[PDB]
Design a protein around this ligand. Structure first.
Ligand SMILES: *[C@@H]1O[C@H](CO)[C@@H](O[C@@H]2O[C@H](CO)[C@@H](O)[C@H](O)[C@H]2NC(C)=O)[C@H](O)[C@H]1NC(C)=O
Ligand SMILES: *[C@@H]1O[C@H](CO)[C@@H](O[C@@H]2O[C@H](CO)[C@@H](O)[C@H](O)[C@H]2NC(C)=O)[C@H](O)[C@H]1NC(C)=O
Ligand SMILES: *[C@@H]1O[C@H](CO)[C@@H](O[C@@H]2O[C@H](CO)[C@@H](O)[C@H](O)[C@H]2NC(C)=O)[C@H](O)[C@H]1NC(C)=O
Ligand SMILES: *[C@@H]1O[C@H](CO)[C@@H](O[C@@H]2O[C@H](CO)[C@@H](O)[C@H](O)[C@H]2NC(C)=O)[C@H](O)[C@H]1NC(C)=O
Ligand SMILES: *[C@@H]1O[C@H](CO)[C@@H](O[C@@H]2O[C@H](CO)[C@@H](O)[C@H](O)[C@H]2NC(C)=O)[C@H](O)[C@H]1NC(C)=O
Ligand SMILES: *[C@@H]1O[C@H](CO)[C@@H](O[C@@H]2O[C@H](CO)[C@@H](O)[C@H](O)[C@H]2NC(C)=O)[C@H](O)[C@H]1NC(C)=O
Lengths: 172, 50, 50, 98
């Protein structure tokens, strides 16, 4: 509102302290943003890693596990999402977020590799290893379908899951 | 005073395999807190006096 | 008499700035509500079956 | 029952206390510890039939097989009453003779 003018500053000086509270409010929301992201994502205490060899009973997670080829180590769907969307003059300033995109990728990778291997046990203590085909059997048993169904229809279920995970890729 | 890069935490590789499980053999009981505001002070202002 | 025009410009710009700040506050509140919902969903559905 | 709502772990109960302008909950939670290593299998072949556990999981320390509950180690001998049968074992991937 002054653009580096002395008399403008002098005249503004007698209006009180509006600017102090304005800057206070802006700083408050700026801090709240980082608090918000950290609350949403930082749900784990460690950084789990997927094993080098992957045999998850026929399920195929290649489209969502991180890709070492890209330096950012973001999976395929994450790359599609990043390529999809597209967006200091006289006092405006943009502050960088506290957490870089690489760190966000690391949290997502840790969560996903934990839930593939451990199940839900890593959310309430120390992660416990459990074969995946033996985990889906527990996961049906929680919706009323006895586990006997899963072991007798493993291949068909795996194929359905892969087809769905490809269809979502194409749609996105 | 030292400035450094943030550490996301420790790093372990869970030893996944297709015929091995881990089952607990003991337990602990923990007590934790959670604090939540529910109210703030009630204020009244008179124009003409102010 | 230049001071009068300076004052008019000052008050106009100040009012515009206040309006912008208020809009930002409203939007931030809405986004915070959305992010709280997102955190609840990630805790309840990713880390366990709902 | 909703995970991580009140207390990190398995919830048991809670206690309220007052505060000058708010409330303070003390959550009591259950946390397992002191894990072990075991060899598992999804079903048991016997007489051509396949047996699945009613509630539990098959484990083996290296020589003998047991059924245990999931959240605590309590091995038990396999009997026809804590297991149920479904078909013959020619389609399950991971059956073990016993
Ligand atoms: C999981 O699915 C992907 C499909 O995206 C498979 O990757 C394909 O593999 C075949 C054979 O190796 C190649 O001809 C294709 O070019 C691959 N697709 C892409 C996009 O690279 C992958 O092989 C599957 N996982 C496993 C273990 O087979
Ligand atoms: C269960 O067995 C696995 C496989 O031996 C153990 O994982 C290894 O533990 C040793 C400790 O001497 C580490 O040096 C290895 O790096 C571990 N392997 C991997 C792939 O990380 C595991 O510790 C055993 N579990 C328990 C509770 O003893
Ligand atoms: C489970 O853990 C508890 C403590 O975490 C163990 O109880 C301890 O046992 C040792 C050895 O007998 C005693 O010196 C401690 O005083 C005990 N702690 C308490 C609080 O009484 C218990 O032994 C563990 N369970 C097993 C099977 O070892
Ligand atoms: C696996 O557990 C079984 C069950 O306890 C062990 O078999 C017993 O071994 C003891 C000797 O330590 C004998 O007195 C029992 O007769 C055996 N049978 C039973 C039913 O208890 C077996 O030794 C364990 N194996 C390992 C490698 O620890
Ligand atoms: C767990 O994974 C191992 C590792 O591949 C499997 O062992 C293979 O079994 C087949 C039999 O169908 C053999 O042809 C391979 O040579 C074995 N691999 C090795 C490295 O020896 C094992 O079958 C898997 N178990 C289950 C229940 O799926
Ligand atoms: C489990 O037991 C069955 C039957 O007792 C075994 O199946 C036999 O295996 C031998 C050796 O390969 C064959 O000569 C027979 O023809 C098989 N009989 C039948 C009815 O299939 C089986 O090999 C044993 N082991 C496993 C891992 O299943």
């Amino acid at each position: 509102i002054c653009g580096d003018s002395t008399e403008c500053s002098n005249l503004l000086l007698q209006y009180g302290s509006f600017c102090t509270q304005l800057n206070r409010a802006l700083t408050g929301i700026a801090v709240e943003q980082d608090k918000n992201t950290q609350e949403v994502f930082a749900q784990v205490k460690q950084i789990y890693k997927t094993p080098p060899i992957k045999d998850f009973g026929g399920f195929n997670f290649s489209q969502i596990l991180p890709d070492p080829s890209k330096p950012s180590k973001r999976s395929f769907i994450e790359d599609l999402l990043f390529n999809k969307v597209t967006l200091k003059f006289n006092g405006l300033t943009v502050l960088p977020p506290l957490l870089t995109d690489e760190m966000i990728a690391q949290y997502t990778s840790a969560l996903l590799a934990g839930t593939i291997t451990s199940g839900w046990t890593f959310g309430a203590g120390a992660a416990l290893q459990i074969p995946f085909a033996m985990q889906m059997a527990y996961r049906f048993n929680g919706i009323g379908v006895t586990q006997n169904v899963l072991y007798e229809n493993q291949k068909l279920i795996a194929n359905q899951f892969n087809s769905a995970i490809g269809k979502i890729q194409d749609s996105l | 005073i030292i400035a450094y890069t943030m550490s996301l935490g420790a790093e372990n590789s869970v030893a996944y395999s297709n015929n091995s499980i881990a089952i607990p053999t003991n337990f602990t009981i923990s007590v934790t807190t959670e604090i939540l505001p529910v109210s703030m002070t009630k204020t009244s202002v008179d124009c003409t006096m102010y | 008499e230049a001071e009068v025009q300076i004052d008019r410009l000052i008050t106009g710009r100040l009012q515009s700035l206040q309006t912008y700040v208020t809009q930002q506050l409203i939007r931030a509140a809405e986004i915070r509500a959305s992010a709280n919902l997102a955190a609840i969903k990630m805790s309840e559905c990713v880390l366990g079956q709902s | 029952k909703r995970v991580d709502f009140c207390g990190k772990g398995y919830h048991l109960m809670s206690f309220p206390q007052s505060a000058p302008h708010g409330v303070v909950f003390l959550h009591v939670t259950y946390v397992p510890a002191q894990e072990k290593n075991f060899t598992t299998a999804p079903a048991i072949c016997h007489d051509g039939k396949a047996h699945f556990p009613r509630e539990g999981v098959f484990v083996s320390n290296g020589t003998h097989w047991f059924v245990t509950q999931r959240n605590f180690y309590e091995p038990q001998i396999i009997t026809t009453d804590n297991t149920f049968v479904s078909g013959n074992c020619d389609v399950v991937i991971g059956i073990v003779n016993n």
